[PDB]
């Protein structure tokens, strides 16, 4: 048995951190966001 001094549970707080490597684009779920333009065969106002 080894009794060791630890940090009291009430003087620390677990905080969830979300780590990201880059900011997702506007049309993140779209494989081809350029197909709204390539399929505008009548024009756009």
């Amino acid at each position: 048995i080894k009794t060791a001094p630890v940090v009291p549970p009430t003087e620390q707080r677990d905080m969830v951190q979300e780590e990201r490597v880059g900011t997702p684009v506007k049309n993140a779920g779209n494989a081809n966001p350029a197909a709204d333009s390539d399929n505008a065969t009548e024009g756009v106002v």
Binding site: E11, R13, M15, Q17
Partner: protein
């Protein structure tokens, strides 16, 4: 390397985390533990802490 045309860079960027912490308590833990290595109550140890 005449046709490479590709570049890679890395951002060592940081944020600020948490609210309601105590920075003096951690700073005490940091500079007390690394006392046989870097002298405590130093300007550099206080900054990094």
């Amino acid at each position: 390397g005449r046709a490479a045309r590709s570049t890679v860079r890395m951002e060592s960027r940081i944020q600020s985390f948490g609210e309601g912490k105590d920075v003096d308590n951690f700073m005490a833990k940091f500079h007390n533990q690394l006392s046989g290595v870097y002298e405590r109550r130093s300007e550099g140890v206080a900054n990094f802490g």
